[PDB]
């Protein structure tokens, strides 16, 4: 038999988190084994070049739990196959839900995306990374994510993306120069419409064909690890793609869909009640962490799962227990994995452990911060006076979850304007505004995420059909933003005062200068201190006194206005002797000159 | 009330493993608390400048469990103090057993040592290291220990050692350059006799004054961590110093020594041995272990002369249970510490968990390997034929425990001769042999330990009263050996095939070329494999064939006979293509040229 009798029982249980070991296509040297979940199927057959595409050649046999199994001699790696499932009167051809690679027969994905029998043999050379990897313990380490869409990042030539293999070395080299710790990849799972960016997924178990083979993707991940970079994958349990050959009405009935019409994006939601659906999804989560050494999983649009109308009420329990058991299972099997959730409701305890009634994610996107911060900085400096509370109040909500600061691709697309485009004033000020924003984002509590091109201050919105405007890296302002982001990341990676985003890690210095739009705050761990002085107005401020707890010489660690970043060059000497009398209720104070639209980061000596 | 009633009960159970929180001298803001264990004392008094050394000025009060405690206003850090204990008719002055710092009023440690009140506030900068310390998992990682006597390493001026601080940057630069992962420091705990090397200990809780303050040592340990170096401390629970004011007959009776007269005399340690029966002794020792890992962030503790604890000549269950609970508490409170033992008997399960009836150490010195290897290469190449079995049979014992292949200070002393001195022939061949020894030791399964000065092959036995013969780094033969060790450690740090010391990590290629004294073996993890071919004769061998598992281009990753190491320059030169001919029972074979007295390490080409 293909299936152990314990297996079937686990599938009925909903506990088969190894299910990729048995479902899908698994080759031998003499043939391939096939296993399908089709509970309301009266018959199932595998069709392929290996058997005349004849529906009667290899009729899989019905086992328990709606599972079908069969062996086909001569079905070999690199063939395409297809399931012909019969629901009573009607018959239909379907793709493998567990397909490990899918490849278009036509050459165009939106036309056809067929399953290919594949062997997943790959040898890793990332032992050192995987032995030192730290998931949940990363709360006390700097986490700086570079978010990437692979096809859009760089083009080998106009309109043709870099392969997985070919992308590895350019991506690793650039990420290391930036100082980013992780790369977040928009969904890699097989999808027909390239314009979906991967969020409409048909092949959950198949890395997209456009950038190479499955093992090509592992080589990329393997390479990135040896270079010391983490890989977080975007994962879409929220919904499945609307493709007829895909998961939609697999048996001729609702299967991955809700059986009930009333509930169910529409219709193309996963029925989290079904034990098989929870199996399929949770196994896929571990599958990526298991076979591809993925460091983290990021779940988007959690609110669409948590509620039903985004006495039973709005909340969907099915989804919350699945989300909870999803996170529990990940951390049980991979204690150093990372789970990130984006939830646009104020659902509490997203970042909380399940045993405290939380969803069990390690991180939550602080999109409130993103909105508030962005709403603040588009406003003209004359007006930032009138909205001072938008900036300062971001910290009242900054500790409700373990948060990642969320500057994201969604923010720079659909008319929202490039981050650069968003900033006000002439070109010098926009580069200044962008340097200030990044400075404040790194100072603000929480982990940092920046999408491709934000590190240049790219002019145009993200277009998936092209590569980012790397040509702007030649004009001075834009290499300066890049130099600024790198220097911020180097400061971030080294100073432990920035690693602790708990309320302990922050102290207010001053937030009352609404008229001058100035903010002074402290970031602390143990003895170590970092002082942040921020000018959101062009008007340079002279003899601006800023209270500090410790006296003595202070150093100017970073100056947003240094010419190396494209600034006016207005700066403190870098040697600053503290005045022994009070300011802002503090024993000493630093008297500085605040450069235009700039951030000063200052540290005491030894 | 200095002592909680919970404090008294835990001390009575011998379960007070934080006992340093309360015993000894603890400075207050206006005075000092003193707490001493003297169960059979009728009176105990604190003497110091802070009371003009008057014995009736501050008489400690008896609490339960024989613990004495009292407060002295005006006793401040940097004050020297003394306990006056009255045993009936007789009175005696004693040092603090829990003294956290000691200094000699005379300025000679032997003539006198004094307990000085110290405050241990120190602000650490080793965040990244200790959040990433792998400890037990280090068994799967490369561990290369550089064993060091701090006073002997380098002298800042003739006959003057470096301070804890002064040594930090010179040593860390050296250890980083040579690629060792950890440094093991010969006992730094306060000791009267410098010539003891620290193994006769008076002040278990005080780092020796010779190199500076406690915080001075903290800077070094902090410093090395920032540089990525682990620190293992040598720890002596077997015996205390035979010093009259020290722990000998502390309260006027046998206290830290065994009460029984027959038990009191032990052949290696004479009258002074720790009475592991006493719960108070168990506290003092296990608290001390945790104290070093707690306040000094040390990564490991290495226990010497474990056989002297286990036997009395036979089994000492007191010592065996103390040993077991020592290891259990260590890993319970500091899961990423490392504990190492040297045992001169074949006692089983030194490296095994207590729950499997082991002693609970993580690592054991492979002294069998050391004696065997040294015995073999001490002998002349003409004779090595007749002792081939001594070389090859070393691996029958290499997987019995988790082993650290150790060449130590004890080997290079007392007329045993330098490692260099140990090797046969003239200087060229001696240097060749030493490159071979290090070559095989890095190839042989197990972690690696090399004592200071061995890395260049210094001539004279290690003399503690002087600094190493660094001037030999000017002569080529020794500068070559140091380069060879560096390259060996780099290979070790980068190749995971050397990290797994299980039997799975080793495969024999051929061992029966006894006549020509050549051995070939494989160090393999997963797909990765490293081929070691060793010629223990000064005649090079040509057209020597070596079987291989995989056929294809192979590269030569290391050649001991490379001119950079002081060698002939003989070698395959790379581009070695396995010949699809069977040899040594293997499918393919390599036709190699074996240089004189040399080690080859070869990798297939990817």
UniProtKB/TrEMBL annotation, chain A:
GO terms for cellular component: cytosol. It comes from Rhodothermus profundi. Pfam families: Alpha-amylase, Alpha-amylase_C, CBM_48. Residues 147-486 form the Glycosyl hydrolase family 13 catalytic domain. This is 1,4-alpha-glucan branching enzyme GlgB. HAMAP family: GlgB (MF_00685). It comes from the Bacteria. It is an enzyme of class 2 (transferase).
């Amino acid at each position: 038999s293909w299936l152990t009798e314990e297996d079937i029982r686990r599938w009925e249980s909903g506990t088969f988190y190894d299910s990729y070991r048995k479902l899908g296509a698994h080759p031998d040297e003499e043939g391939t084994w096939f296993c399908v979940w089709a509970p309301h199927a009266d018959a199932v057959s595998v069709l392929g070049a290996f058997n005349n595409w004849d529906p009667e050649a290899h009729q899989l046999e019905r086992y328990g739990a709606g599972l079908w199994a069969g062996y086909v001699p001569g079905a070999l790696p690199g063939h395409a196959y297809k399931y012909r499932i019969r629901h009573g009167f009607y018959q239909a051809d379907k793709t493998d839900p567990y397909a490990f690679a899918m490849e278009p027969p036509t050459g165009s994905p939106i036309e056809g995306l067929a399953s290919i029998i594949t062997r997943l043999d790959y040898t890793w050379h990332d032992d050192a990374w995987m032995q030192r990897r730290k998931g949940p313990a990363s709360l006390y380490e700097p986490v700086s994510i570079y978010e990437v869409h692979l096809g859009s990042w760089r083009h080998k030539q106009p309109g043709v993306s870099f392969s997985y293999r070919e992308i590895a070395e350019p991506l690793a080299d650039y990420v290391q120069d930036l100082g980013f710790t992780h790369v977040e990849l928009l969904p890699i799972m097989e999808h027909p419409y390239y314009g979906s960016w991967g969020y409409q997924v048909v092949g959950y178990y198949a890395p997209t064909f456009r950038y190479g083979t499955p093992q090509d993707l592992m080589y990329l991940i393997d390479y990135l690890h040896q270079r010391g970079i983490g890989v977080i994958l975007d994962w879409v349990p929220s919904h499945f793609a609307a493709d007829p050959q895909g998961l939609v009405y697999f048996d001729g009935t609702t299967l991955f869909e809700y059986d009930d019409p009333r509930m169910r994006w529409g219709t193309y939601v996963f029925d989290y009640n079904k034990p098989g659906v929870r199996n399929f999804l949770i196994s896929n989560a571990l599958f990526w962490l298991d076979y591809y050494h993925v460091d983290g999983l990021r779940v988007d649009a959690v609110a669409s799962m948590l509620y039903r109308d985004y006495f039973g009420g709005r909340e969907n329990l099915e989804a919350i227990d699945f989300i909870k058991k999803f996170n529990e299972t990940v951390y049980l099997h991979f204690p150093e994995a990372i789970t990130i959730a984006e939830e646009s409701t104020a659902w509490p305890g997203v970042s909380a452990p399940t045993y405290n009634n939380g969803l069990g994610f390690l991180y939550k996107w602080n999109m409130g911060w993103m909105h508030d911060t962005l709403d603040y900085m588009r406003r003209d400096p004359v007006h930032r006076k009138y909205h001072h509370d938008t900036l300062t109040f971001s910290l009242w909500y900054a500790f409700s979850e373990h948060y990642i600061l969320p500057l994201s691709h969604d923010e720079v697309v659909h008319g929202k304007g490039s981050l650069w485009t968003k900033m006000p004033g002439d070109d010098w000020q926009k580069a200044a505004n962008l340097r200030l924003l990044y400075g404040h984002m790194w100072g603000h509590p929480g982990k940092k995420l920046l999408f491709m091109g934000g590190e240049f201050g790219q002019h145009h919105e993200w277009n998936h059909d092209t590569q980012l405007e790397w040509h702007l890296l030649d004009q001075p302002y834009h290499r300066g933003i890049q130099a600024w982001v790198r220097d911020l990341n180097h400061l971030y990676r080294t100073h432990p005062a920035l690693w602790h985003d708990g309320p302990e890690g922050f102290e207010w210095i001053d937030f009352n200068d609404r008229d001058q739009s100035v903010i002074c705050y402290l970031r602390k761990h143990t003895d170590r201190l970092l002082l942040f002085v921020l000018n959101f107005t062009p008007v340079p401020r002279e003899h601006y006194r800023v209270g500090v707890p410790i006296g003595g010489p202070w150093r100017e660690v970073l100056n947003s206005d240094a010419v190396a970043y494209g600034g006016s060059g207005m700066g403190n000497f870098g040697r600053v002797e503290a005045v022994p009398e009070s300011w802002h209720g503090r024993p000493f104070h630093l008297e500085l000159t605040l450069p235009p639209l700039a951030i000063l980061i200052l540290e005491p000596e030894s």
